[PDB]
Design a protein around this nucleic acid. Sequence first.
RNA 1: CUUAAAGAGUCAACCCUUUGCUUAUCUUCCCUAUUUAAAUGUUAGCAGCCGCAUAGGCUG
DNA 2: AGCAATTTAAATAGGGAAGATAAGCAAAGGGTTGACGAAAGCC
DNA 3: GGCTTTCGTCAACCCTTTGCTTATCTTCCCT
Lengths: 186, 278, 247, 99
Amino acid sequence: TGKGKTLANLKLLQHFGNVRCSFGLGMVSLTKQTAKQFLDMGVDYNSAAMVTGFSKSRFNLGSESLDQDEVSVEYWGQTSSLSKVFPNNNAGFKNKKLLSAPILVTTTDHLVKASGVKKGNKQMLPYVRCMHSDLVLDEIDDYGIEDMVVLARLVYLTACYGNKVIISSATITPAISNIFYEAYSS
Amino acid sequence: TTTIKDCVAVTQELQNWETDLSIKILCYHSRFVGDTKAQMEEYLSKVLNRKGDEYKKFVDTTTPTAYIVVATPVVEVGRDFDFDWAIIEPSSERSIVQCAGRVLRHRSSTPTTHNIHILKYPFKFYRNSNICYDVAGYESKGYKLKSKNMLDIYKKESIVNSVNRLQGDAAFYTKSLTALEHKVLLDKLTTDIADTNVFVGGWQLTANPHEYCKWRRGTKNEDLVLTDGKWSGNVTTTKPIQSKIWRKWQGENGSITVPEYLLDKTICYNDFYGGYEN
Amino acid sequence: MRKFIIVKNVKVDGINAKSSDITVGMPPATTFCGLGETMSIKTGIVVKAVSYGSVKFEVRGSRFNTSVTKFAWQDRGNGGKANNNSPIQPKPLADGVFTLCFEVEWEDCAEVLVDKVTNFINTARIAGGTIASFNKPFVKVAKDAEELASVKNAMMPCYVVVDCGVEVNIFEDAVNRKLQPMVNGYKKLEKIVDNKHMRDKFTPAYLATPTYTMIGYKMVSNVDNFDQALWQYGENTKVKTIGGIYN
Amino acid sequence: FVENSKLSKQLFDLNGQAAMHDQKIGNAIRTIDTWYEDATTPIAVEPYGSVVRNGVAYRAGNKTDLFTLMDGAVNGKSLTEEDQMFVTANLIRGGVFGG
RNA sequence: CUUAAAGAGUCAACCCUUUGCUUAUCUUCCCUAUUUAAAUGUUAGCAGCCGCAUAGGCUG
DNA sequence: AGCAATTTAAATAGGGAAGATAAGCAAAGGGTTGACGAAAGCC
DNA sequence: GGCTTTCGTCAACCCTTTGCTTATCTTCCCT
């Protein structure tokens, strides 16, 4: 920690060319931190899309003009061609930010539904998202055991279409690193 | 510490603790109202930032003071905090490594004697001596430690880093915490398909990997909501001990997440420490 | 990867409590291993191990003497003596509510496995006792060790048998370390040359003296490893636990 | 005398009406003992000359308690009129004097 | 195919009687419950008289 | 036709008495539960 | 030539007066 892991992940993604990735992170505030790093280093909202699907009421006080912080939800971005095959032209704000994002800095639960769902059509949007985009999962050790199982299911599904999985965990256990490699290998 | 009532027990003991030290106590668990919780976060991020000396102005560093933050595993995940020292209630070894990462995270000065004091037992030993590390840990009913003594299951003096988690040991998992951790990790995330496993094949066709392997599997979790100072369910606001509280932010809106088990009794929300059993 | 079927609250009465000459009380693991191989024969589901626990168990009699059974004049040629009371050979009787858990390997649905075990148990006889009642058996699987403990805790409430081993002999340690002795198998003495008065004429027969191991009763949830409660036929003409000696 | 009563001072309320104990009165009847050693004020007639308030017994440890004078009188030791009157006063006060 | 296989414990009853737990107790002192304030919400849905009306209108 | 306010503190202490006794009877049953060996009629 | 019935044969104690174990419970997290 403290060495700039997420910046190194973006560097590794950009080494192969232009970036198309889903930064799936635990917690809302860690996604906010990675979004703020992406904003102040080089990434605008035409490429980045911070997705936290709860609409929290945590606002910044003191000075709105002198903030230079509090990464928000606008996504000027670019609507992908996949929105025409989704129901009713995808959706409003949230699913447009999901599907059409080049870089999707999101909470992870908007990506683990790609592996499948009980009832409804909630699988298709993260499925089609992870089909054409890379997957970057940071500090996977903080998740639960079943959470890590479904995250490696997501890694297997992402590798099923040739995309690249970046795992960023310092305290990795050989077991975890191995089963994530075996999911990527399958 | 491990859980919320453990945190308020450590807080209520330390507040009533007579000493010459100027203890200033904070509670940092997850059961808090929208406003109060967010306020704790921003304050803690701006006082524990030790890459510069900007914090000297967010706390009273003029007077010798012990600024103590009693927290649950919400501090060891995703927090850019830098403490001078930590006292850890043992639940898992990755908790030890992460709370080591909350001490001297921003500085580079080496400690001289000892900067982490690990407790002898988790507090669930006095409540359940059969199993005590299952809360926020990989101990469970199928993987039981033979002894719960941390002299038996951990090194008495140890340089805590990622090395013990990085190495990986499957032998002697019943009397060491690290090998207990590694055992569970290879016995649940295995190269099989099972039904709740990771290579799942044949079952993707079925609804089984989405029912028996539930993402964010938590307890029932109902949400008692504070509406403008007036609580919804069986909450009953209370008064904290006002002995050593350094900072206490008030809250009026927001919601608290209470497990259905603790819904039976009053969660007794308080401005200083959120939920407990009283 | 392990599969189990549990029959909970098996109320059985008329149990032949005479486990051996020096043990009267709970039937040993040879009895329940014999019950397991009996279903391996009638139902065809081949059983590796059985973990059995005692919910309730009372030996019929006082605290120092068992209630003997009033014998019936059933031998041939002793008519004329039939008006008097038949002589009593020692066979203590007991009642017991048990919980059984059979390690099976099965390839069909759980409903036909439950039906086969139910059809066996309806015609079974625990330790010479008529099965008075039993709950509907349920199938549970032990994929991992936490799942093994799930099966373990599904036998609640019952006191399972864990093996604690023989140090010197049976009487000494039963007083000293206070553990219970039971038949873990038998010792072969002589080959039997007369197969006329036996069940089969082709199955080889031996006179046997029961070997005993020393065991303890622990509640199934307090048992750390479920393999230390699953008894199975060992290859020493004895029975043994999968987990070995309980420590 | 009260303990767990959530009320600091009770009063003897005979059916609500304020009253004082009979023992309070009867102690004030037998406050006639002016015949102990440091005899300045009358104290209550007790086998030891004991008062709860002053924390001292005026007839203890100095061979003028009721038990030694009772043993003496019984044996034959002529009791002085004041000692005799003290022993008689404790007898009409009452109490177990055995042991 | 489980120390497998098998077995009716039956019966009967008088616990009696007797009794002295008495004795004496000082609960007692102490003291600030203090300071506020719009009841608003139309706050009333009436009295006659024009009429067959307990339909509908008028009068203040 | 619902609206009923907030904090603050709930007493320190001294005592819970010993001396006596705590019955003596008389009962408390056995009745069946025996397998080998040896004469001795009997197919 | 067994075979089944009934009668005769051979014995002799030192007892002790409940526990065995003791039940399958919430941290993160975001939706």
